RNA sequence: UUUGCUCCACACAAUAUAGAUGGAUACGAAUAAGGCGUCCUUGUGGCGUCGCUGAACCAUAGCAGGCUAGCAACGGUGCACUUGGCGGAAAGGCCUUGGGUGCUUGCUGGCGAAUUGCAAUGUCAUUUUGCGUGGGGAUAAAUCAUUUGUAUACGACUUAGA
RNA sequence: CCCUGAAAAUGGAUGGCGCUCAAGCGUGUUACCUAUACUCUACCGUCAGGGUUGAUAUGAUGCCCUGACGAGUAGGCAGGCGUGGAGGUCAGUGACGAAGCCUAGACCGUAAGGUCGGGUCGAACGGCCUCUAGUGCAGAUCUUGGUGGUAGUAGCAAAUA
RNA sequence: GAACUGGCGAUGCGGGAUGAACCGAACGUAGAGUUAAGGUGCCGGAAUACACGCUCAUCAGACACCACAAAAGGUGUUAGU
């Protein structure tokens, strides 16, 4: 039978699995869309 | 059973001492063979007179061949058939070269359009239409115009092999 | 399949030999088997069948 | 050689092993007929082991024949062996398992003298 | 009869092509299918998209990563159709499936090899004119395939290069036909015509 | 000559079978270039060889042969039935066989 | 590491084959339309011709293919050399310049084959290797142990140490 | 015929893939596929009907001829296989190796089983005609004994060290 | 819960995917041929046979037992009175 009281789910199912990242340096998955008219430039930087 | 022939079936009641020479009733029956033709004869004689096969006899069964089996004819057919919810009378027109072929077309068409099985069809009448202006259905009328001619667009050619090397055409 | 009208493999229900192990009775049976095969007298067949019977089927005379 | 015989047909060369003798060690291969009420073997469902039947019986003209065409007669001594003296093309002598080696030598010599084939001439040979 | 048969999937109906290819592979013929994105399915696009969404909802409830997988590429949709027509769970089915390659577009080395058609699976020969049909590439893009544009660009490049090949081929075959015709009506030509050549 | 073939190519398709039971004593063979039972009537009685390779050399060769013959036609599409001295091993479903031209009635 | 590793050649041994037995022979698009050829006042142009299947085209003769001289002509086709290009979708292939050399059944010439005994796949392919021969090339790392805490139940992770 | 009427809970079922001048629906004509069914043949068994004795055959519940049959729980009957012991016989086997045991080695039988080879072993044991029974095991939460997986696992953490 | 018959129980085999009972057919061991019921795109043996029509569904339909559908409606389309 039904829950008898509605509640939102606990936690976000889009951040699964809650495993260890394969590297200590997180991967950059998407870069900004290229604007070929602009001067050449880095789209990201590294730091601590 | 649509390898149809036409038979004349003539039969009668069995002669008795008080009534010799009964009245020799005759029917025209479309059927695949003589056994079915005699069955249909007794079916209709039972349904219209008080004569069953046990009290009667088939005097003659003869196959009637089309007199001019190689000239295109317009045929008017009257049928009565049984639907799922009642009995109906129908008139149809078939353009074809012989009576048996018209009746074959009739059975196929009644099966296709009304789901009427052979069991469910009585062919009341098949008669050649003597002349035009008596044809009343447009699907027959449109083939009776002057200088008729039409193409057959989109020809599909049979291929004997699994793979073709040419990406075929439908010209005709 | 066959629609059997009678029981299959049915033994005739008659003794074809004496049940006894008397060798002399068996020699008598051999004699009358030969006699009933090689003569047409029904007497020999009757005697041969009578030689098969049990004690209760041969009451004293 | 032996008497000429028709070709030997066995009709079932495969041992009839008891059901689940490959499943449980406690069930021996010696054939037993399943008598359970639900047994698929007894009910002869497709894909199961076959059961021994009288239909598999050997042709009576080749039954008991060895592939050489001889019937086997077990012999324990020379006197047993001469019982096959006049029957060398239908019977072959087999020396019993419990005959000593020095007696097997004598049996083999007599069999070679009389023409009797011996099925196991190599048993207990000394070297 | 060829060691490898390369099938141009453009204009074929997916299920009839799948049935033909499955029987070929099961009978031991090697098949490479190119231009899977140009395959056809009978019925309107919205109808086939509804069918694929109904496919998409089927998944193992307690773990979706083990449920039925929903491949979006046109070549994998056709491969899915080929499964179900091959008993893929047997060793013989795995061998028949290993005899098969399916591609979007025509990659090398097949871009320089002859492509054939399967007339019993050709839409133009099979579907009644006026019946709606679906294009596999657009259906795949709608259900989440990512590479329709790059395939179209790269196929345009292959088509221009192929057109240059064909113009050269036309020149050579016209030369050969004219020189053959010049050498016709000679004694050998007369005798070969008498023999049927 | 670049060709030396004196046999017709064929494919071993399957055993004789119903939907769920096969019969390994009979093999179904598709002969290349044969499409009707009328055409397949030509090849009835022709010897068939399945040729295969082994690592171990047996009798002066490493390539072994299984002999059989065409018995009757099968279906409407030129497939024939064949029987072999020993049944074909069913891993050959899809393998090539050779239908020879002997015994010849032509 | 019983003088290691790797790559070309090479004869040997194994090997094990989802199945060689003349050739996978390349436009694109349309199908109620097209292909090819030709011509022009270059088009969504005129004219002609074709399809109705690859039943085609190429190839195809020679001890499983041995031994040889020419003739018109400078063809055809392999093998190494070589000139330049083109191809990145998985390019790993395609095209081309020039010479050398073998064969040529385009035609006319010259010898042989047998006895596998009346058939027996009658062995001609394609992989993966290991041992040798003779030429070329190169001359490391990882783990354990120790160490850190951006990590951690243990593994694992992240650092450092000639 | 199609559509509306036509709403249920894990994701899912014309069996599946898929199929649209069908690979759908109605109807017709053929060809083809395959059951332990039908036809013919062989072999096994069963039942039935028969032949076979004046020098001719293991001397007859033997040999042979002919025909037809063959599903089966509970159950009935028949013919056989195997075990302990008893009478008789083979003047049987055996320390030159009995019995037992092991043997993806061989042979016979439809089968119960029988026989042989090889290895191990050390003192008795078989074939045949009969007699006799405390005579055949997979189960009984069967009895007694022995041994697993679990598993190098749980646990060996109260009483300050 | 009764009647008659045929079955299952006690029974495998081919077909209905699957299933005690449905269809076909009942069974010694084999070979050859032919079929039953059911099928012949592929799974899967067997015509992507031939022929006449009907149907396009933004919940099509697809074989008896059997795994459901109604009253009521539609200038959808097809025949007809």
Swiss-Prot record, chain A:
Role according to the record = Component of the ribosome, a large ribonucleoprotein complex responsible for the synthesis of proteins in the cell. The small ribosomal subunit (SSU) binds messenger RNAs (mRNAs) and translates the encoded message by selecting cognate aminoacyl-transfer RNA (tRNA) molecules. The large subunit (LSU) contains the ribosomal catalytic site termed the peptidyl transferase center (PTC), which catalyzes the formation of peptide bonds, thereby polymerizing the amino acids delivered by tRNAs into a polypeptide chain.
What binding partners and quaternary form does the record give?
Component of the large ribosomal subunit (LSU). Mature yeast ribosomes consist of a small (40S) and a large (60S) subunit. The 40S small subunit contains 1 molecule of ribosomal RNA (18S rRNA) and 33 different proteins (encoded by 57 genes). The large 60S subunit contains 3 rRNA molecules (25S, 5.8S and 5S rRNA) and 46 different proteins (encoded by 81 genes). uL3 forms together with ES39L one of the contact sites for the signal recognition particle that targets ribosomes to the endoplasmic reticulum membrane.
Q: Which domain of life is it from?
A: Eukaryota
Per the record, the similarity remark reads: Belongs to the universal ribosomal protein uL3 family.
- Covalent cross-link (Glycyl lysine isopeptide (Lys-Gly) (interchain with G-Cter in ubiquitin)), residues: 38
Annotated knockout phenotype: A mutant confers resistance to trichodermin, a trichotecene toxin produced by plant-pathogenic fungi.
Q: Which residues carry this modification: Phosphoserine?
A: 23
Subcellular location per UniProt equals: Cytoplasm
Q: Which protein is depicted?
A: Large ribosomal subunit protein uL3
Swiss-Prot record, chain C:
- According to the lineage, what is the superkingdom? Eukaryota
For this entry, the protein name equals: Large ribosomal subunit protein eL18A
Q: What else is known?
A: There are 2 genes for eL18 in yeast.
Compartments, as annotated in UniProt: Cytoplasm
User: Any idea what job this protein has?
Assistant: Component of the ribosome, a large ribonucleoprotein complex responsible for the synthesis of proteins in the cell. The small ribosomal subunit (SSU) binds messenger RNAs (mRNAs) and translates the encoded message by selecting cognate aminoacyl-transfer RNA (tRNA) molecules. The large subunit (LSU) contains the ribosomal catalytic site termed the peptidyl transferase center (PTC), which catalyzes the formation of peptide bonds, thereby polymerizing the amino acids delivered by tRNAs into a polypeptide chain.
Question: Positions modified as N6,N6,N6-trimethyllysine?
Answer: 49
Provide the assembly information: Component of the large ribosomal subunit (LSU). Mature yeast ribosomes consist of a small (40S) and a large (60S) subunit. The 40S small subunit contains 1 molecule of ribosomal RNA (18S rRNA) and 33 different proteins (encoded by 57 genes). The large 60S subunit contains 3 rRNA molecules (25S, 5.8S and 5S rRNA) and 46 different proteins (encoded by 81 genes). eL18 interacts with NAP1.
Family that this chain belongs to: Belongs to the eukaryotic ribosomal protein eL18 family.
Disulfide links within the chain: none
UniProtKB/Swiss-Prot annotation, chain E:
What are the recorded GO MF terms, alphabetically? mRNA binding; RNA binding; structural constituent of ribosome
Cellular compartment(s)? Cytoplasm
UniProt KW Transferase keyword: no
Q: Which domain of life is it from?
A: Eukaryota
Supply the InterPro entries for this chain: Ribosomal_uL13, Ribosomal_uL13_CS, Ribosomal_uL13_euk/arc, Ribosomal_uL13_sf
Q: Name one Pfam family in it.
A: Ribosomal_L13
Q: What does this protein do?
A: Component of the ribosome, a large ribonucleoprotein complex responsible for the synthesis of proteins in the cell. The small ribosomal subunit (SSU) binds messenger RNAs (mRNAs) and translates the encoded message by selecting cognate aminoacyl-transfer RNA (tRNA) molecules. The large subunit (LSU) contains the ribosomal catalytic site termed the peptidyl transferase center (PTC), which catalyzes the formation of peptide bonds, thereby polymerizing the amino acids delivered by tRNAs into a polypeptide chain.
Which family, according to the similarity comment?
Belongs to the universal ribosomal protein uL13 family.
Its quaternary structure?
A: Component of the large ribosomal subunit (LSU). Mature yeast ribosomes consist of a small (40S) and a large (60S) subunit. The 40S small subunit contains 1 molecule of ribosomal RNA (18S rRNA) and 33 different proteins (encoded by 57 genes). The large 60S subunit contains 3 rRNA molecules (25S, 5.8S and 5S rRNA) and 46 different proteins (encoded by 81 genes).
What's the name of the protein? Answer: Large ribosomal subunit protein uL13A
What taxonomic lineage is listed for the species of origin?
Answer: Eukaryota, Fungi, Dikarya, Ascomycota, Saccharomycotina
Curated annotation (Swiss-Prot), chain F:
Family (UniProt): Belongs to the eukaryotic ribosomal protein eL33 family.
What superkingdom heads the lineage?
Answer: Eukaryota
Oligomeric state and interaction partners are given as: Component of the large ribosomal subunit (LSU). Mature yeast ribosomes consist of a small (40S) and a large (60S) subunit. The 40S small subunit contains 1 molecule of ribosomal RNA (18S rRNA) and 33 different proteins (encoded by 57 genes). The large 60S subunit contains 3 rRNA molecules (25S, 5.8S and 5S rRNA) and 46 different proteins (encoded by 81 genes).
Q: Where are the N-acetylalanine modifications? A: 1
Functionally, this protein is described as follows: Component of the ribosome, a large ribonucleoprotein complex responsible for the synthesis of proteins in the cell. The small ribosomal subunit (SSU) binds messenger RNAs (mRNAs) and translates the encoded message by selecting cognate aminoacyl-transfer RNA (tRNA) molecules. The large subunit (LSU) contains the ribosomal catalytic site termed the peptidyl transferase center (PTC), which catalyzes the formation of peptide bonds, thereby polymerizing the amino acids delivered by tRNAs into a polypeptide chain.
Name the GO cellular-component terms: cytosol; cytosolic large ribosomal subunit
State the organism of origin: Saccharomyces cerevisiae (strain ATCC 204508 / S288c) (Baker's yeast)
Q: Which Pfam families match?
A: Ribosomal_L35Ae (PF01247)
What kind of modification does the protein receive after translation?
A: N-terminally acetylated by acetyltransferase NatA.
Q: In which compartments does the protein localize?
A: Cytoplasm
Q: What is this protein called?
A: Large ribosomal subunit protein eL33A
Q: Which positions hold the covalent cross-link Glycyl lysine isopeptide (Lys-Gly) (interchain with G-Cter in ubiquitin)? A: 46
Task: Reproduce the miscellaneous comment text.
Answer: There are 2 genes for eL33 in yeast.
| MF annotations from Gene Ontology | structural constituent of ribosome
């Amino acid at each position: 039978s039904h829950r008898k009281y509605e509640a939102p789910r606990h936690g976000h199912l889009g951040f699964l699995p809650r495993k260890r990242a394969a590297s200590i340096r997180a991967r950059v998955k998407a870069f900004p869309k290229d604007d070929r008219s602009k001067p050449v430039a880095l789209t990201s930087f590294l730091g601590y | 059973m649509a390898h149809f022939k036409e038979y004349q079936v003539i039969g009668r009641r069995l002669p008795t001492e008080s009534v010799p020479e009964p009245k020799l009733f005759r029917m025209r029956i479309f059927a695949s063979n003589e056994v079915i033709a005699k069955s249909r004869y007794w079916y209709f004689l039972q349904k219209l007179h008080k004569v069953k096969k046990a009290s009667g006899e088939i005097v003659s069964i003869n196959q009637i061949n089309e007199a001019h089996p190689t000239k295109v004819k317009n045929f008017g057919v009257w049928v009565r058939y049984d639907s799922r919810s009642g009995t109906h009378n129908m008139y149809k027109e078939i353009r074809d070269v012989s009576r048996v072929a018209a009746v074959e077309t009739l059975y196929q068409d009644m099966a296709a359009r009304h789901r009427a099985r052979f069991r469910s069809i009585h062919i009341l009448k098949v008669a050649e239409i003597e002349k035009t202006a008596d044809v009343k259905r447009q699907y027959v009328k449109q083939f009776l115009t002057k200088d008729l001619k039409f193409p057959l667009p989109h020809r599909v050619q049979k291929s004997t092999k699994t793979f073709s090397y040419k990406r075929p055409s439908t010209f005709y | 399949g066959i629609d059997h009208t009678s029981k299959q493999h049915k033994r005739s229900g008659h003794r074809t030999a004496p049940k006894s192990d008397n060798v002399y009775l068996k020699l008598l049976v051999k004699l009358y088997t030969f006699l009933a095969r090689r003569t047409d007298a029904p007497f020999n067949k009757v005697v041969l069948k009578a030689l098969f019977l049990s004690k209760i089927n041969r009451p004293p005379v | 050689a032996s008497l000429p015989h028709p070709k030997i047909v066995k009709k079932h060369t495969k041992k009839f092993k008891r059901h689940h003798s490959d499943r449980y060690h406690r069930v021996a291969e010696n054939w037993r007929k399943q008598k359970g009420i639900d047994s698929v073997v007894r009910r002869r469902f497709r894909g199961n082991i076959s059961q021994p039947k009288i239909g598999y019986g050997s042709n009576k003209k080749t039954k008991f024949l060895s592939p050489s065409g001889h019937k086997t007669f077990l012999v324990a001594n020379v006197k047993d062996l001469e019982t096959l003296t006049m029957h060398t093309k239908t019977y072959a002598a087999e020396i019993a398992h419990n005959i000593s080696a020095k007696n097997r030598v004598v049996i083999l010599a007599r069999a070679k003298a009389l023409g009797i084939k011996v099925t196991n001439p190599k048993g207990r040979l000394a070297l | 009869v060829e060691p490898v048969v390369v099938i141009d999937g453009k204009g074929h109906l997916v299920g009839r092509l799948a049935s033909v290819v499955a029987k070929q592979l099961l009978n031991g013929q090697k098949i490479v299918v190119v231009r899977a994105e140009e395959l056809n399915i009978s019925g309107e696009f919205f109808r086939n998209k509804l069918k694929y969404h109904d496919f998409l909802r089927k998944a193992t409830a307690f773990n979706k990563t083990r449920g039925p997988f929903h491949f979006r590429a046109p070549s994998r949709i056709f491969y899915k159709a080929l499964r179900g027509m091959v008993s893929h769970k047997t060793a013989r089915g795995k061998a028949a499936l290993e005899r098969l390659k399916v591609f979007e577009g025509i990659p090398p080395p097949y871009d320089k090899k002859k492509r054939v058609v399967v007339p019993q699976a050709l839409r133009v020969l099979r579907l009644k004119p006026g019946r709606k049909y679906t294009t596999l590439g657009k259906l795949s893009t709608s259900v989440g395939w990512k590479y329709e544009d790059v395939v179209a660009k790269l196929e345009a490049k292959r088509k221009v290069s192929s057109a240059e090949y064909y113009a050269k081929k036309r020149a050579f075959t016209k030369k050969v036909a004219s020189a053959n015709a010049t050498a016709a009506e000679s004694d050998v030509a007369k005798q070969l015509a008498a023999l049927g050549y | 000559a670049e060709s030396h073939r004196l046999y017709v190519k064929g494919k071993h398709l399957s055993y004789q079978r119903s939907k769920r039971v096969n019969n390994p004593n009979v093999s179904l063979i598709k002969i290349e270039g044969v499409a009707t039972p009328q055409d397949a009537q030509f090849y009835l009685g022709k010897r068939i060889a399945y040729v295969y390779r082994a690592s171990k050399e047996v009798r002066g060769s490493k390539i072994r042969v299984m002999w059989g013959k065409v018995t009757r036609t099968h279906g409407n599409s030129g497939v024939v039935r064949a029987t072999f001295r020993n049944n074909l091993p069913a891993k050959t479903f899809g393998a090539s066989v050779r239908i020879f031209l002997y015994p010849s009635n032509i």
